[PDB]
Sequence to fold (10 residues):
Amino acid sequence: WNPADYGGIK
Fold:
């Protein structure tokens, strides 16, 4: 969920 996972692409 961190910004280099969910906040990046989705």
About this structure: The two ends are 10 Å apart (CA to CA). DSSP finds no helices and no strands in the chain. The CA atoms of residues 1 and 10 lie 10 Å apart.
